[PDB]
Amino acid sequence: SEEVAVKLNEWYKLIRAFEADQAEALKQEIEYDLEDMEENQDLLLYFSLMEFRHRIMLDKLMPVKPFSDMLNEIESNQQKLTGLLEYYFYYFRGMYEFKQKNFILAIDHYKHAEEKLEYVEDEIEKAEFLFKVAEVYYHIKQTYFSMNYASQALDIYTKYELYGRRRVQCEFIIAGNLTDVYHHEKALTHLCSALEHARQLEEAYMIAAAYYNVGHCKYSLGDYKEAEGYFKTAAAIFEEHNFQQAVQAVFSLTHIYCKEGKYDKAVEAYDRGIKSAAEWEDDMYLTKFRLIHELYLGSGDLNVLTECFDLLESRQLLADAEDLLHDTAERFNQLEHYESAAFFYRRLMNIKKKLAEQR
Amino acid sequence: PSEEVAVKLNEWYKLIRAFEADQAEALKQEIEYDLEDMEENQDLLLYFSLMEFRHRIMLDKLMPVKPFSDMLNEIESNLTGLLEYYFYYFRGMYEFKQKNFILAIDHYKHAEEKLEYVEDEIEKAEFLFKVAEVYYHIKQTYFSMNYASQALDIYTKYELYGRRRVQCEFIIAGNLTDVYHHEKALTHLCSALEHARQLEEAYMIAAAYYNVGHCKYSLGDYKEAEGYFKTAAAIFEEHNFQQAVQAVFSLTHIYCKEGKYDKAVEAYDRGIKSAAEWEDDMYLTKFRLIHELYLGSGDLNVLTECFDLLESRQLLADAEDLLHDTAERFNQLEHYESAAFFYRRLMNIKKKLAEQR
Amino acid sequence: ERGMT
Amino acid sequence: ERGMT
Ligand SMILES: [Cl-]
Ligand SMILES: [Cl-]
């Protein structure tokens, strides 16, 4: 009854602390305790929700090259959900939609979960929710709300002296937002602090992410030479530990080689990137690689570029589409292909409008 | 008497915030008359000077003319608690009036630190509105939205349906328009228009009409927006408000986009004449811009010069709109080089707007 | 242009 | 591109 219900909450704590081995051991213990008890739909729905959250953690730590199944099972009994479980329902599904790059849907789930945030018992657990909200807001370039949520989260971690993965991630988001408003120096200060904090965590994923973000910031600043090494370092760490983030890292590396006119290195990075993206079945980065290749290493065929942007927009990756459109428009402008430049400037306008109306 | 005149000074402030010009003026003359028959009290004299400054702001809003900096220098040549709050707040109001938005915000933010000395919640609502107002003019939508919502909630809570509440509705709608939520903006504007009519103040009714036209223009309904700009222009011009210049400008601009060049010329002449009478060099620059673009030969040097003046004056939101219009105009004329030139500058302006966050 | 207040 | 978390 309450005892196993306590175990489920103790399981939740291990999950949020990224304690994979301890979470697995406690899950199996709960499973045995559930099969040796009477019919309890309240705890069965509790377990199903927590099992879903558990798989999200495992996939994040150890990604591979049945979420939908678990999702539909939970949704089949959502009329029974109330209070705490209803909060988990919207929160966990919001987390899953973020993974699937369905940002608008993720936010809608988060906002519904936020209405029942009273069922969170401690500020540290609350801080995780605030980060996740700030995280998805950053991916739709909602800078204002993202900064607000990330700052609240960061203050909680600072207050309780909890220097874990979540705090470093809060620093990433704050820096990312600052870069979006071109406050690069402030952003770099945060990223430098986040990098050393990531090293203290001794987690390869976070160290590599920290290196990418510094490169990302310097790239935005225009320091292309410096950004090279950061992208290269991040790509190496991500590949060595078999993370899918290695794809994005190589893409940014390829893109910057193209911008610098380092076509030989761009070609090598391109081949490396499309091969990696193919292994991860990452169709969107394959499209992105196809785009920049056409723009820099190819003929610059407008039909190919249009199709690539059509694909990005159809997947609702508007922030990335905005960046690549700006890059495409400016590229044709620098090459004095004014008709093509004007064409992509207008599509850039359209995307900026869609970005603004979604907020 | 030094304790009783402070009471009168606060009563004077109340009348000023309520736009009661006649009563405020009578109390101003009485206080200033009584101060001449008193010993020299420093903080009390600074109290008066600050309030006289706030009084002149109110008078110019109700009855504009075609000494502010002089009395500003006297104030700045000279504070703690309440008087320090007034110091930053009133100077913030002045800077907004002079279209110095960044400086106005900086002043407001310093004033906000001393907001604890404000006991009147309605008084706080006015402050929150003014903050929302200036944020809107630099397109900081969500800071503006938050402050405007806080202010609107206070006015609603006290059921105080005066000028400030309508202005709050104007700002909220203006912000919604900036994020292309025209349907929600129109809902707020139609409510604001009726609230303006209830105030029976020509200024607010005309402003409501302009804002409806502004929203519909952003929506793309040029035909409807034309009528609203016309009505707003007529009302503002009847009561001799400087807002008639902007109203006629938007009217001139929409005539140009509709292709009604005869009416555009007529509105243009009317507008530059009014802008000259008000010594509004910036609208003279704006009129020259759209005339060259639509009614002239579209000379790039002339256009660039006009945009250079707008940007240097830090009117980034206005420059953004006009740059977008200029780029779009050259694009549909298939002047792609000129179009790309203004699209690039539009990019640069959007970046500047964003950097100021 | 900006809306009026 | 978006920064990583
Ligand atoms: Cl943590
Ligand atoms: Cl009022």
Side-chain angles (χ1 to χ4, degrees), chain B residues 17-19 122 126 155 160-167 199:
Chain B
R17 303 193 310 272
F19 293 91
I122 293 298
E126 185 205 49
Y155 291 130
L160 186 72
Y161 302 154
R163 171 180 292 216
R164 260 58 164 100
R165 185 207 166 83
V166 183
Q167 288 174 312
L199 289 179

PDB file of all heavy atoms in Angstrom, chain B residues 17-19 122 126 155 160-167 199, ligand 2:
ATOM      1  N   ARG B  17      -2.183  63.610 -11.213  1.00  0.00           N
ATOM      2  CA  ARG B  17      -2.356  62.251 -11.716  1.00  0.00           C
ATOM      3  C   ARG B  17      -3.765  62.032 -12.264  1.00  0.00           C
ATOM      4  O   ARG B  17      -3.973  61.195 -13.139  1.00  0.00           O
ATOM      5  CB  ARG B  17      -2.047  61.221 -10.625  1.00  0.00           C
ATOM      6  CG  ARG B  17      -0.654  61.350 -10.027  1.00  0.00           C
ATOM      7  CD  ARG B  17      -0.289  60.129  -9.197  1.00  0.00           C
ATOM      8  NE  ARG B  17      -1.326  59.786  -8.227  1.00  0.00           N
ATOM      9  CZ  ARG B  17      -1.401  60.295  -7.003  1.00  0.00           C
ATOM     10  NH1 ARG B  17      -0.499  61.175  -6.595  1.00  0.00           N
ATOM     11  NH2 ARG B  17      -2.377  59.925  -6.184  1.00  0.00           N
ATOM     12  N   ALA B  18      -4.726  62.792 -11.748  1.00  0.00           N
ATOM     13  CA  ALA B  18      -6.112  62.674 -12.191  1.00  0.00           C
ATOM     14  C   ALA B  18      -6.412  63.585 -13.380  1.00  0.00           C
ATOM     15  O   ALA B  18      -7.560  63.692 -13.809  1.00  0.00           O
ATOM     16  CB  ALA B  18      -7.068  62.970 -11.038  1.00  0.00           C
ATOM     17  N   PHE B  19      -5.374  64.237 -13.901  1.00  0.00           N
ATOM     18  CA  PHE B  19      -5.506  65.150 -15.038  1.00  0.00           C
ATOM     19  C   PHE B  19      -6.506  66.275 -14.774  1.00  0.00           C
ATOM     20  O   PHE B  19      -7.209  66.720 -15.683  1.00  0.00           O
ATOM     21  CB  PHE B  19      -5.886  64.391 -16.314  1.00  0.00           C
ATOM     22  CG  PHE B  19      -4.813  63.467 -16.814  1.00  0.00           C
ATOM     23  CD1 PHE B  19      -4.771  62.144 -16.407  1.00  0.00           C
ATOM     24  CD2 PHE B  19      -3.846  63.923 -17.697  1.00  0.00           C
ATOM     25  CE1 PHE B  19      -3.783  61.292 -16.868  1.00  0.00           C
ATOM     26  CE2 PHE B  19      -2.857  63.076 -18.163  1.00  0.00           C
ATOM     27  CZ  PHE B  19      -2.827  61.759 -17.748  1.00  0.00           C
ATOM     28  N   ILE B 122      -3.012  52.761  -6.456  1.00  0.00           N
ATOM     29  CA  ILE B 122      -3.377  53.362  -7.735  1.00  0.00           C
ATOM     30  C   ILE B 122      -2.194  54.143  -8.294  1.00  0.00           C
ATOM     31  O   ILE B 122      -1.943  54.142  -9.499  1.00  0.00           O
ATOM     32  CB  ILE B 122      -4.594  54.298  -7.589  1.00  0.00           C
ATOM     33  CG1 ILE B 122      -5.842  53.494  -7.226  1.00  0.00           C
ATOM     34  CG2 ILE B 122      -4.835  55.077  -8.873  1.00  0.00           C
ATOM     35  CD1 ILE B 122      -6.243  52.492  -8.281  1.00  0.00           C
ATOM     36  N   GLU B 126      -0.019  53.549 -11.974  1.00  0.00           N
ATOM     37  CA  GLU B 126       0.427  54.515 -12.972  1.00  0.00           C
ATOM     38  C   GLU B 126       1.890  54.282 -13.323  1.00  0.00           C
ATOM     39  O   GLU B 126       2.270  54.320 -14.493  1.00  0.00           O
ATOM     40  CB  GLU B 126       0.250  55.951 -12.477  1.00  0.00           C
ATOM     41  CG  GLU B 126       0.592  56.991 -13.540  1.00  0.00           C
ATOM     42  CD  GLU B 126       1.016  58.322 -12.954  1.00  0.00           C
ATOM     43  OE1 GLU B 126       1.881  58.329 -12.053  1.00  0.00           O
ATOM     44  OE2 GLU B 126       0.492  59.364 -13.404  1.00  0.00           O
ATOM     45  N   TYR B 155      -6.201  48.660 -11.704  1.00  0.00           N
ATOM     46  CA  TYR B 155      -7.304  49.525 -12.121  1.00  0.00           C
ATOM     47  C   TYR B 155      -8.638  48.788 -12.099  1.00  0.00           C
ATOM     48  O   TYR B 155      -9.660  49.347 -11.698  1.00  0.00           O
ATOM     49  CB  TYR B 155      -7.039  50.098 -13.514  1.00  0.00           C
ATOM     50  CG  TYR B 155      -5.900  51.085 -13.540  1.00  0.00           C
ATOM     51  CD1 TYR B 155      -4.877  50.975 -14.472  1.00  0.00           C
ATOM     52  CD2 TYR B 155      -5.836  52.117 -12.613  1.00  0.00           C
ATOM     53  CE1 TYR B 155      -3.829  51.874 -14.487  1.00  0.00           C
ATOM     54  CE2 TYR B 155      -4.795  53.019 -12.622  1.00  0.00           C
ATOM     55  CZ  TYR B 155      -3.793  52.893 -13.557  1.00  0.00           C
ATOM     56  OH  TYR B 155      -2.755  53.795 -13.562  1.00  0.00           O
ATOM     57  N   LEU B 160     -11.392  51.586 -11.219  1.00  0.00           N
ATOM     58  CA  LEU B 160     -11.039  52.933 -11.641  1.00  0.00           C
ATOM     59  C   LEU B 160     -10.859  52.955 -13.150  1.00  0.00           C
ATOM     60  O   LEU B 160      -9.804  52.586 -13.666  1.00  0.00           O
ATOM     61  CB  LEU B 160      -9.754  53.395 -10.954  1.00  0.00           C
ATOM     62  CG  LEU B 160      -9.357  54.851 -11.212  1.00  0.00           C
ATOM     63  CD1 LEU B 160     -10.294  55.800 -10.475  1.00  0.00           C
ATOM     64  CD2 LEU B 160      -7.912  55.100 -10.819  1.00  0.00           C
ATOM     65  N   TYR B 161     -11.896  53.386 -13.857  1.00  0.00           N
ATOM     66  CA  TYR B 161     -11.879  53.364 -15.311  1.00  0.00           C
ATOM     67  C   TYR B 161     -11.574  54.744 -15.881  1.00  0.00           C
ATOM     68  O   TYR B 161     -12.442  55.397 -16.460  1.00  0.00           O
ATOM     69  CB  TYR B 161     -13.209  52.828 -15.851  1.00  0.00           C
ATOM     70  CG  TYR B 161     -13.551  51.440 -15.351  1.00  0.00           C
ATOM     71  CD1 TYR B 161     -14.870  51.015 -15.266  1.00  0.00           C
ATOM     72  CD2 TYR B 161     -12.553  50.556 -14.959  1.00  0.00           C
ATOM     73  CE1 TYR B 161     -15.185  49.748 -14.807  1.00  0.00           C
ATOM     74  CE2 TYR B 161     -12.857  49.289 -14.500  1.00  0.00           C
ATOM     75  CZ  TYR B 161     -14.173  48.890 -14.426  1.00  0.00           C
ATOM     76  OH  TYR B 161     -14.479  47.629 -13.968  1.00  0.00           O
ATOM     77  N   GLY B 162     -10.331  55.181 -15.711  1.00  0.00           N
ATOM     78  CA  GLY B 162      -9.892  56.466 -16.219  1.00  0.00           C
ATOM     79  C   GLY B 162      -9.023  56.324 -17.453  1.00  0.00           C
ATOM     80  O   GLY B 162      -9.048  55.293 -18.127  1.00  0.00           O
ATOM     81  N   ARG B 163      -8.247  57.364 -17.745  1.00  0.00           N
ATOM     82  CA  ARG B 163      -7.374  57.377 -18.915  1.00  0.00           C
ATOM     83  C   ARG B 163      -6.312  56.277 -18.867  1.00  0.00           C
ATOM     84  O   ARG B 163      -6.028  55.634 -19.877  1.00  0.00           O
ATOM     85  CB  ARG B 163      -6.709  58.749 -19.059  1.00  0.00           C
ATOM     86  CG  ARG B 163      -5.611  58.804 -20.108  1.00  0.00           C
ATOM     87  CD  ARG B 163      -4.989  60.192 -20.195  1.00  0.00           C
ATOM     88  NE  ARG B 163      -5.921  61.184 -20.725  1.00  0.00           N
ATOM     89  CZ  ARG B 163      -5.568  62.196 -21.513  1.00  0.00           C
ATOM     90  NH1 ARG B 163      -4.300  62.354 -21.869  1.00  0.00           N
ATOM     91  NH2 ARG B 163      -6.484  63.049 -21.951  1.00  0.00           N
ATOM     92  N   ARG B 164      -5.738  56.056 -17.689  1.00  0.00           N
ATOM     93  CA  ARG B 164      -4.644  55.097 -17.550  1.00  0.00           C
ATOM     94  C   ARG B 164      -5.055  53.665 -17.885  1.00  0.00           C
ATOM     95  O   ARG B 164      -4.281  52.922 -18.489  1.00  0.00           O
ATOM     96  CB  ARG B 164      -4.032  55.166 -16.150  1.00  0.00           C
ATOM     97  CG  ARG B 164      -2.734  55.963 -16.072  1.00  0.00           C
ATOM     98  CD  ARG B 164      -2.918  57.394 -16.555  1.00  0.00           C
ATOM     99  NE  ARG B 164      -1.815  58.258 -16.142  1.00  0.00           N
ATOM    100  CZ  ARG B 164      -0.802  58.620 -16.924  1.00  0.00           C
ATOM    101  NH1 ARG B 164      -0.740  58.197 -18.180  1.00  0.00           N
ATOM    102  NH2 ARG B 164       0.151  59.413 -16.450  1.00  0.00           N
ATOM    103  N   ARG B 165      -6.267  53.280 -17.498  1.00  0.00           N
ATOM    104  CA  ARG B 165      -6.748  51.935 -17.785  1.00  0.00           C
ATOM    105  C   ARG B 165      -6.857  51.692 -19.286  1.00  0.00           C
ATOM    106  O   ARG B 165      -6.442  50.646 -19.783  1.00  0.00           O
ATOM    107  CB  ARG B 165      -8.097  51.665 -17.124  1.00  0.00           C
ATOM    108  CG  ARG B 165      -8.551  50.230 -17.310  1.00  0.00           C
ATOM    109  CD  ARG B 165     -10.056  50.092 -17.267  1.00  0.00           C
ATOM    110  NE  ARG B 165     -10.481  48.786 -17.762  1.00  0.00           N
ATOM    111  CZ  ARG B 165     -10.497  47.678 -17.027  1.00  0.00           C
ATOM    112  NH1 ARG B 165     -10.111  47.717 -15.759  1.00  0.00           N
ATOM    113  NH2 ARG B 165     -10.896  46.532 -17.560  1.00  0.00           N
ATOM    114  N   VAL B 166      -7.419  52.662 -20.004  1.00  0.00           N
ATOM    115  CA  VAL B 166      -7.530  52.564 -21.456  1.00  0.00           C
ATOM    116  C   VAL B 166      -6.147  52.463 -22.087  1.00  0.00           C
ATOM    117  O   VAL B 166      -5.926  51.654 -22.988  1.00  0.00           O
ATOM    118  CB  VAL B 166      -8.282  53.768 -22.058  1.00  0.00           C
ATOM    119  CG1 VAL B 166      -8.434  53.599 -23.561  1.00  0.00           C
ATOM    120  CG2 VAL B 166      -9.646  53.923 -21.402  1.00  0.00           C
ATOM    121  N   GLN B 167      -5.216  53.281 -21.599  1.00  0.00           N
ATOM    122  CA  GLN B 167      -3.839  53.259 -22.083  1.00  0.00           C
ATOM    123  C   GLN B 167      -3.195  51.883 -21.887  1.00  0.00           C
ATOM    124  O   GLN B 167      -2.437  51.415 -22.738  1.00  0.00           O
ATOM    125  CB  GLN B 167      -3.010  54.344 -21.391  1.00  0.00           C
ATOM    126  CG  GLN B 167      -3.332  55.768 -21.832  1.00  0.00           C
ATOM    127  CD  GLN B 167      -2.595  56.815 -21.012  1.00  0.00           C
ATOM    128  OE1 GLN B 167      -2.575  56.756 -19.782  1.00  0.00           O
ATOM    129  NE2 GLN B 167      -1.981  57.777 -21.692  1.00  0.00           N
ATOM    130  N   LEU B 199     -15.115  57.863 -21.470  1.00  0.00           N
ATOM    131  CA  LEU B 199     -14.335  58.943 -20.875  1.00  0.00           C
ATOM    132  C   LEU B 199     -14.704  60.286 -21.488  1.00  0.00           C
ATOM    133  O   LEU B 199     -14.475  61.337 -20.886  1.00  0.00           O
ATOM    134  CB  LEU B 199     -12.838  58.695 -21.065  1.00  0.00           C
ATOM    135  CG  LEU B 199     -12.201  57.572 -20.248  1.00  0.00           C
ATOM    136  CD1 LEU B 199     -10.723  57.462 -20.578  1.00  0.00           C
ATOM    137  CD2 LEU B 199     -12.406  57.818 -18.765  1.00  0.00           C
TER     138      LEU B 199
HETATM  139 CL    CL E   2      -6.556  57.063 -14.554  1.00  0.00          CL
END
